[PDB]
């Protein structure tokens, strides 16, 4: 992927996502040559703009340096802008003509990154399949979450996108997926006989999948209200973590085999009930300093009297022979105390205590971010003159996560993008819960901003079997 | 044990062992208060000497400091010397009178240390049982290796010592034992379900017990010929390591149940054949610098045409349900390339390779000495763009070993002293081997001084299944 020219087409170039997270990421890609050598970037939006205006609105977010200001100039030597609507054929044939008016534009592999409102996918993808399909190079599409709201909406969206493109062409991207420590789980789970045989019912007591970040929903509060944390991160990222924790041994390294194991694992999970769910929402802190004093419901763009939760705790059971009856817990939330994304694996106590009940359940932490590291909280005898053991943390272990994921999109590695059938599995898992939520409008319990989450999630973990030291 | 007075009686005070390793060790114990508060040291030998003579001939080996020069006279205020023969009743009654002529001497707990020539045990222990018995406190003795030469001699010695003292009063000491990594093996084995349930036939590839020394036997060459390396270190130390590795889970942490499991495992071992043994003798180096230029046969005190081995490679298979057919490799020698005392635990390759045959068996090294440490040479993903692991070093981790070994017999904790039944099983297992050697007079393979050892041992590891990376 270093000789065949590639083009990165940002639909919604004037959009805020393209302005803050896409263009800076592609620039960081271009600075160190991680992109293909012949890389073109095409912006697309409604209002008429120019490359100079794009520079004006993007340079502050670039974090540019005079050492590679020349590399920045080379970066904007490859940028172009096309203006048009998204629901008209004239603009799209104009875009096709502009794209073909390049160095082997027809031969160029197009990589479509959609940064558009969710309501517009149904027309954007259709017009793409009508007009912007390459006849020489491959076509890949990146859709941004969420991919629907419930079972029927997701089914219609997935069926439409599948009738348009094959599954090899769809990259349902996941922003928060670290791809470095999640990649470390794979090696640490297959490359060891130490961890292999104990990856079954009789050994792994429970599984904790946690995703926390310290900040809330500043400014863009009206975007969360209709979606919720479940559809935001936990149905995609937390379930990806659950699949990569509970899955069987894949037949090979291949992405399709791993995703088949994912599909089998979710197929071996029964429906989620109301009593296996805890929901919470954050409120302002009277003792807060910055945004902590102002809550989620206090956002003017958030409608008054909204029952949309931002913290969701749901336990899952993967009922098959390898994972029958085992707990899998999911803790996710916004505006929590600490930024963290870890997979904690508490193992069963050894049958028969000999150390006078001083043994603790062994743990295996896989911290995705920040400070990517993996450590096992096992115990050894402390130095001195006795025999009692002590718990100890022992370390077991480059571009950023989003940049690495876009690199994977170039490389065609679909190991960690959710499949259409995988997404259908995930959606029918929560269809009863989502339907009951949308009908009854349950009230999530307020929780303190910058806290560890509502105590009901801890109650869930203790009830299912999790032990707290 | 800091209120009841203790007596440390070194029988063989004039001996080189007492002058070199016993008195410096007890002095190091006393400088730090490791001995009980009211401790007495009673040297006993044949030649008439005095406390001043003991000071004169033992000071250079103490390594004293001007900071604690006062502790020197504190130590020698508690010393005493008694002269007498080893097989006369008058001398032992005089010694008993000397011991009774002390602060609560009859109440005092006496702790002997038989560091005299082994040819005297049969009579010295009998005279001890006749005269040197305290009717108030505990009585213990320390018999020095070797504990006989064959099954019959060992059985006779053990029967006599058993008729004299109960097994609670018999401490068959081992100098080379570590008491730190050996003490850590049990906790690493029992407090973890990471290593607990995989600790059986299906997962462990094999076990390696290596014990190498850098120096030969210069000076004391006439002592190894009659004994052999097997009866020196392999019989006691490496066998104790095998027992600690392979023993079943005890009902508790007490030495009684631990040695019961020792006995069970020993009973579950078949006899050793000549094809399961590799024997070697070291020879001088033409390219050596110091003692390396002279081999064992070049020592004038070694009889000419001596077929005593200094390298022992003997493989045991603990034939029971939990360890049916798994290898246990025991390697020990003198004058090897580097000092090392390690227990290497290699696990099976995972059932079904998926990393394109880049799998290396997980290792759990327990280096007793030097540089006490446990490190698992497991393999984890290398940072970068590629989905491959690398073999990486992961560390898992105070008086010296001999000091706490002596503190063991002070405290009465018999965790690491071999039982009579364990010793009988140990001698039974090696009886056919030693008898065949004594009959046919085999020729050990000459091997390079300061090398890794003869290639026959490595071929033994390869045959039994050990893998070299």
mmCIF file of N, CA, C and O in Angstrom, chain A residues 174-217:
data_model
loop_
_atom_site.group_PDB
_atom_site.id
_atom_site.type_symbol
_atom_site.label_atom_id
_atom_site.label_comp_id
_atom_site.label_asym_id
_atom_site.label_seq_id
_atom_site.Cartn_x
_atom_site.Cartn_y
_atom_site.Cartn_z
ATOM 1 N N UNK A 174 -14.645 2.286 15.189
ATOM 2 C CA UNK A 174 -14.824 2.475 16.625
ATOM 3 C C UNK A 174 -13.692 3.364 17.122
ATOM 4 O O UNK A 174 -12.531 2.945 17.134
ATOM 5 N N UNK A 175 -14.037 4.585 17.539
ATOM 6 C CA UNK A 175 -13.024 5.595 17.830
ATOM 7 C C UNK A 175 -12.120 5.174 18.980
ATOM 8 O O UNK A 175 -10.891 5.259 18.880
ATOM 9 N N UNK A 176 -12.712 4.710 20.077
ATOM 10 C CA UNK A 176 -11.987 4.511 21.324
ATOM 11 C C UNK A 176 -11.147 3.243 21.348
ATOM 12 O O UNK A 176 -10.391 3.045 22.305
ATOM 13 N N UNK A 177 -11.261 2.384 20.340
ATOM 14 C CA UNK A 177 -10.545 1.114 20.339
ATOM 15 C C UNK A 177 -9.051 1.392 20.248
ATOM 16 O O UNK A 177 -8.570 1.924 19.243
ATOM 17 N N UNK A 178 -8.321 1.041 21.308
ATOM 18 C CA UNK A 178 -6.911 1.390 21.374
ATOM 19 C C UNK A 178 -6.084 0.733 20.287
ATOM 20 O O UNK A 178 -5.143 1.337 19.766
ATOM 21 N N UNK A 179 -6.403 -0.516 19.951
ATOM 22 C CA UNK A 179 -5.745 -1.320 18.927
ATOM 23 C C UNK A 179 -4.325 -1.719 19.311
ATOM 24 O O UNK A 179 -3.683 -2.462 18.561
ATOM 25 N N UNK A 180 -3.810 -1.265 20.452
ATOM 26 C CA UNK A 180 -2.478 -1.677 20.873
ATOM 27 C C UNK A 180 -2.532 -2.612 22.078
ATOM 28 O O UNK A 180 -1.852 -3.641 22.099
ATOM 29 N N UNK A 181 -3.336 -2.269 23.086
ATOM 30 C CA UNK A 181 -3.538 -3.169 24.216
ATOM 31 C C UNK A 181 -4.629 -4.192 23.931
ATOM 32 O O UNK A 181 -4.544 -5.336 24.396
ATOM 33 N N UNK A 182 -5.652 -3.803 23.173
ATOM 34 C CA UNK A 182 -6.612 -4.780 22.678
ATOM 35 C C UNK A 182 -5.909 -5.791 21.781
ATOM 36 O O UNK A 182 -6.225 -6.986 21.799
ATOM 37 N N UNK A 183 -4.937 -5.333 20.990
ATOM 38 C CA UNK A 183 -4.081 -6.260 20.262
ATOM 39 C C UNK A 183 -3.214 -7.091 21.196
ATOM 40 O O UNK A 183 -2.875 -8.230 20.858
ATOM 41 N N UNK A 184 -2.841 -6.550 22.357
ATOM 42 C CA UNK A 184 -2.057 -7.314 23.317
ATOM 43 C C UNK A 184 -2.859 -8.422 23.979
ATOM 44 O O UNK A 184 -2.274 -9.441 24.360
ATOM 45 N N UNK A 185 -4.172 -8.240 24.136
ATOM 46 C CA UNK A 185 -5.006 -9.315 24.666
ATOM 47 C C UNK A 185 -4.886 -10.571 23.819
ATOM 48 O O UNK A 185 -4.808 -11.687 24.346
ATOM 49 N N UNK A 186 -4.868 -10.406 22.498
ATOM 50 C CA UNK A 186 -4.850 -11.558 21.606
ATOM 51 C C UNK A 186 -3.603 -12.401 21.849
ATOM 52 O O UNK A 186 -3.687 -13.624 22.045
ATOM 53 N N UNK A 187 -2.439 -11.750 21.870
ATOM 54 C CA UNK A 187 -1.180 -12.449 22.098
ATOM 55 C C UNK A 187 -1.141 -13.038 23.500
ATOM 56 O O UNK A 187 -0.789 -14.206 23.687
ATOM 57 N N UNK A 188 -1.510 -12.246 24.507
ATOM 58 C CA UNK A 188 -1.428 -12.724 25.880
ATOM 59 C C UNK A 188 -2.407 -13.862 26.149
ATOM 60 O O UNK A 188 -2.243 -14.587 27.134
ATOM 61 N N UNK A 189 -3.405 -14.049 25.288
ATOM 62 C CA UNK A 189 -4.366 -15.126 25.463
ATOM 63 C C UNK A 189 -4.056 -16.362 24.632
ATOM 64 O O UNK A 189 -4.455 -17.464 25.021
ATOM 65 N N UNK A 190 -3.360 -16.224 23.501
ATOM 66 C CA UNK A 190 -3.045 -17.400 22.691
ATOM 67 C C UNK A 190 -1.614 -17.893 22.831
ATOM 68 O O UNK A 190 -1.369 -19.094 22.677
ATOM 69 N N UNK A 191 -0.666 -17.010 23.116
ATOM 70 C CA UNK A 191 0.745 -17.350 23.115
ATOM 71 C C UNK A 191 1.203 -17.995 24.415
ATOM 72 O O UNK A 191 2.408 -18.193 24.602
ATOM 73 N N UNK A 192 0.279 -18.322 25.315
ATOM 74 C CA UNK A 192 0.623 -18.821 26.637
ATOM 75 C C UNK A 192 -0.167 -20.082 26.947
ATOM 76 O O UNK A 192 -1.388 -20.110 26.771
ATOM 77 N N UNK A 193 0.531 -21.121 27.404
ATOM 78 C CA UNK A 193 -0.122 -22.218 28.106
ATOM 79 C C UNK A 193 -0.353 -21.889 29.574
ATOM 80 O O UNK A 193 -1.136 -22.577 30.239
ATOM 81 N N UNK A 194 0.301 -20.844 30.084
ATOM 82 C CA UNK A 194 0.062 -20.399 31.452
ATOM 83 C C UNK A 194 -1.375 -19.918 31.609
ATOM 84 O O UNK A 194 -2.040 -20.214 32.609
ATOM 85 N N UNK A 195 -1.873 -19.170 30.626
ATOM 86 C CA UNK A 195 -3.202 -18.577 30.671
ATOM 87 C C UNK A 195 -4.239 -19.368 29.884
ATOM 88 O O UNK A 195 -5.433 -19.075 29.993
ATOM 89 N N UNK A 196 -3.818 -20.360 29.104
ATOM 90 C CA UNK A 196 -4.709 -21.063 28.212
ATOM 91 C C UNK A 196 -5.736 -21.923 28.922
ATOM 92 O O UNK A 196 -6.939 -21.650 28.879
ATOM 93 N N UNK A 197 -5.279 -22.995 29.576
ATOM 94 C CA UNK A 197 -6.213 -23.909 30.250
ATOM 95 C C UNK A 197 -7.055 -23.261 31.335
ATOM 96 O O UNK A 197 -8.084 -23.833 31.717
ATOM 97 N N UNK A 198 -6.653 -22.101 31.846
ATOM 98 C CA UNK A 198 -7.398 -21.415 32.892
ATOM 99 C C UNK A 198 -8.359 -20.410 32.273
ATOM 100 O O UNK A 198 -8.967 -19.598 32.978
ATOM 101 N N UNK A 199 -8.494 -20.454 30.950
ATOM 102 C CA UNK A 199 -9.435 -19.597 30.228
ATOM 103 C C UNK A 199 -10.736 -20.349 29.954
ATOM 104 O O UNK A 199 -11.155 -20.535 28.814
ATOM 105 N N UNK A 200 -11.377 -20.785 31.031
ATOM 106 C CA UNK A 200 -12.573 -21.609 30.925
ATOM 107 C C UNK A 200 -13.473 -21.318 32.122
ATOM 108 O O UNK A 200 -13.270 -20.336 32.842
ATOM 109 N N UNK A 201 -14.468 -22.180 32.337
ATOM 110 C CA UNK A 201 -15.425 -21.965 33.418
ATOM 111 C C UNK A 201 -14.758 -22.058 34.784
ATOM 112 O O UNK A 201 -14.924 -21.174 35.632
ATOM 113 N N UNK A 202 -13.997 -23.130 35.012
ATOM 114 C CA UNK A 202 -13.584 -23.489 36.363
ATOM 115 C C UNK A 202 -12.562 -22.527 36.953
ATOM 116 O O UNK A 202 -12.288 -22.604 38.155
ATOM 117 N N UNK A 203 -11.991 -21.632 36.152
ATOM 118 C CA UNK A 203 -10.899 -20.791 36.623
ATOM 119 C C UNK A 203 -11.247 -19.312 36.656
ATOM 120 O O UNK A 203 -11.110 -18.675 37.708
ATOM 121 N N UNK A 204 -11.693 -18.741 35.541
ATOM 122 C CA UNK A 204 -11.977 -17.310 35.492
ATOM 123 C C UNK A 204 -13.278 -17.056 36.248
ATOM 124 O O UNK A 204 -14.354 -17.469 35.808
ATOM 125 N N UNK A 205 -13.176 -16.384 37.398
ATOM 126 C CA UNK A 205 -14.348 -16.164 38.241
ATOM 127 C C UNK A 205 -15.340 -15.221 37.577
ATOM 128 O O UNK A 205 -16.540 -15.505 37.531
ATOM 129 N N UNK A 206 -14.860 -14.091 37.065
ATOM 130 C CA UNK A 206 -15.716 -13.124 36.390
ATOM 131 C C UNK A 206 -14.838 -12.231 35.526
ATOM 132 O O UNK A 206 -13.609 -12.308 35.568
ATOM 133 N N UNK A 207 -15.486 -11.391 34.727
ATOM 134 C CA UNK A 207 -14.800 -10.489 33.813
ATOM 135 C C UNK A 207 -15.367 -9.088 33.991
ATOM 136 O O UNK A 207 -16.588 -8.900 34.006
ATOM 137 N N UNK A 208 -14.481 -8.106 34.124
ATOM 138 C CA UNK A 208 -14.867 -6.708 34.275
ATOM 139 C C UNK A 208 -14.331 -5.931 33.084
ATOM 140 O O UNK A 208 -13.123 -5.942 32.822
ATOM 141 N N UNK A 209 -15.225 -5.253 32.371
ATOM 142 C CA UNK A 209 -14.867 -4.426 31.224
ATOM 143 C C UNK A 209 -15.242 -2.986 31.544
ATOM 144 O O UNK A 209 -16.428 -2.647 31.606
ATOM 145 N N UNK A 210 -14.236 -2.141 31.739
ATOM 146 C CA UNK A 210 -14.434 -0.779 32.205
ATOM 147 C C UNK A 210 -13.918 0.218 31.175
ATOM 148 O O UNK A 210 -12.864 0.007 30.568
ATOM 149 N N UNK A 211 -14.670 1.302 30.977
ATOM 150 C CA UNK A 211 -14.297 2.381 30.057
ATOM 151 C C UNK A 211 -14.668 3.718 30.691
ATOM 152 O O UNK A 211 -15.848 4.079 30.722
ATOM 153 N N UNK A 212 -13.677 4.457 31.177
ATOM 154 C CA UNK A 212 -13.946 5.735 31.815
ATOM 155 C C UNK A 212 -13.074 6.829 31.214
ATOM 156 O O UNK A 212 -11.918 6.605 30.847
ATOM 157 N N UNK A 213 -13.648 8.027 31.140
ATOM 158 C CA UNK A 213 -12.955 9.254 30.788
ATOM 159 C C UNK A 213 -13.432 10.364 31.715
ATOM 160 O O UNK A 213 -14.583 10.353 32.160
ATOM 161 N N UNK A 214 -12.573 11.343 32.021
ATOM 162 C CA UNK A 214 -12.891 12.277 33.112
ATOM 163 C C UNK A 214 -13.890 13.367 32.745
ATOM 164 O O UNK A 214 -14.560 13.919 33.624
ATOM 165 N N UNK A 215 -14.014 13.680 31.462
ATOM 166 C CA UNK A 215 -14.846 14.789 31.023
ATOM 167 C C UNK A 215 -16.230 14.291 30.634
ATOM 168 O O UNK A 215 -16.444 13.100 30.394
ATOM 169 N N UNK A 216 -17.169 15.230 30.576
ATOM 170 C CA UNK A 216 -18.553 14.910 30.297
ATOM 171 C C UNK A 216 -18.982 15.147 28.864
ATOM 172 O O UNK A 216 -18.322 14.699 27.923
ATOM 173 N N UNK A 217 -20.097 15.854 28.693
ATOM 174 C CA UNK A 217 -20.694 16.064 27.379
ATOM 175 C C UNK A 217 -20.749 17.567 27.107
ATOM 176 O O UNK A 217 -21.800 18.113 26.754
#
